[PDB]
Amino acid sequence: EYKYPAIKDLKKPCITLGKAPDLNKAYKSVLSGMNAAKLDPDDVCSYLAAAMQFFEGTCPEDWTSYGILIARKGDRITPNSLVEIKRTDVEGNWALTGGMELTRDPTVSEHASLVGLLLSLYRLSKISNYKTNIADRIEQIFETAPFVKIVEHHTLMTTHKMCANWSTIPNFRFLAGTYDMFFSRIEHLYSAIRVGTVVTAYEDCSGLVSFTGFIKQINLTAREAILYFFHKNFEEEIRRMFEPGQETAVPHSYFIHFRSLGLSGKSPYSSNAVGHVFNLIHFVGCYMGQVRSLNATVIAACAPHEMSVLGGYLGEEFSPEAVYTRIMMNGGRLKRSHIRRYVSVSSNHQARPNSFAEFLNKTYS
Amino acid sequence: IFVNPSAIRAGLMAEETVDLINRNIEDNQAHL
């Protein structure tokens, strides 16, 4: 709930890293670590930031967000244009550890592959198995022209196993978000790098994303859909999500990557922050049989018992006055028909701990 | 507790937030 992301002072998102390395040496050190599963997170970030210079493209339209100009139509930019990287006097370590067959200097094509593989440790870390499906596909993308094979199959997963928590290293998360924001705006030769960074888009905005996804699914306008959220706790939640000045409607705004770029540590759009709304949406998904909703986590604090009642009636539709009428007429209680339906779905589902399906089984079965 | 939705008719860029967010998520699918 606490911190809205809108930059108030025209300052670009900023991080500080060590002293800029010679890029050929940095490549060699970092590839060596990738091969030995022994990566240094400060070195990786320093390298990732310095490699930004290789990803130049033309801005197709003016680009401004929170008063900050990033580029004008036609400017040549790199991801470095989106942020400020400060650097200290302190050299990184740059150890050679694993295999280094390469005497000569790396090509730009080789840098981009390594950048791509390093960033993909963000996505792999973000998943709490199916990692090997993801990892094998990623490895293949980065062996496929315009990328170059620089590592052996199964290297990425081995290294990931050692880097499983890198998605909460703030500098690495920052660099993933910056590369994702760049390639979202600039169609680029190396755009397939987003395979690793795409998950930064809308991080900590589950409540807002559920809400917008719900509007699409019931196939109504946003004005019409808000009328169905008629319980009194929804009012402050809906206000919270449409706070002005936040650029939720602005294409390519820093808003889209606010969490990863550190604009706020305390999202007002998360599932917790709009818990009543989130709970209702997913009880409606449960009533419809949607597996995404049955395996979501209930927001314990936000009257899930009451949200489940409203969700039955809303689930029964799918007029907002007609729904309100039925609920008052029934004294705010579910009908036996609603209960039969919720139980039919939940009781046939592989219910996870703290999930909506578990709640339904504990409550109504 | 439950407020009447004919009473809710009197209240104030949500439409295009909805439309932007859903479209960006639809494109992000290509990368996943």
Numbering used by the authors:
A (entry chain A): 27 to 154, 160 to 349, 401 to 447
B (entry chain B): 4 to 15, 20 to 39
Paper text:
Thus, genome replication requires the production of the unassembled RNA-free N protein, named N0, in the form a complex named the N0−P complex, in which P prevents the polymerization of N and the illegitimate assembly with cellular RNA until N is transferred to nascent viral RNA.
In this study, we reconstituted a soluble heterodimeric complex between an armless N protein of rabies virus (RABV), lacking its N-terminal subdomain (NNT-ARM), and a peptide encompassing the N0 chaperon module of the P protein. The NΔ230−P68 complex crystallized with a single molecule in the asymmetric unit and the crystals diffracted up to 2.3 Å resolution. In the absence of neighboring N subunits, the entire NCT-ARM (aa 350–400) was not visible in the crystal structure and a 5-residue loop in NNTD (aa 155–159) was also absent from the crystal structure, suggesting that it was flexible in the absence of RNA as expected, since this loop interacted with one of the bound nucleotides in the N−RNA complex. The binding of the P68 N-terminal moiety involved three H-bonds and four salt-bridges and buried a surface area of 1190 Å2, whereas the binding of the P68 C-terminal moiety involved thirteen H-bonds and three salt bridges and buried a surface area of 1617 Å2. As in other Mononegavirales N0−P complexes, the P chaperone module prevented the polymerization of N by interfering with the binding of the NNT-ARM and NCT-ARM subdomains from adjacent N subunits. The N-terminal part of RABV P68 competed with the NCT-ARM of the Ni+1 protomer, whereas the C-terminal part competed with the NNT-ARM of the Ni–1 protomer.
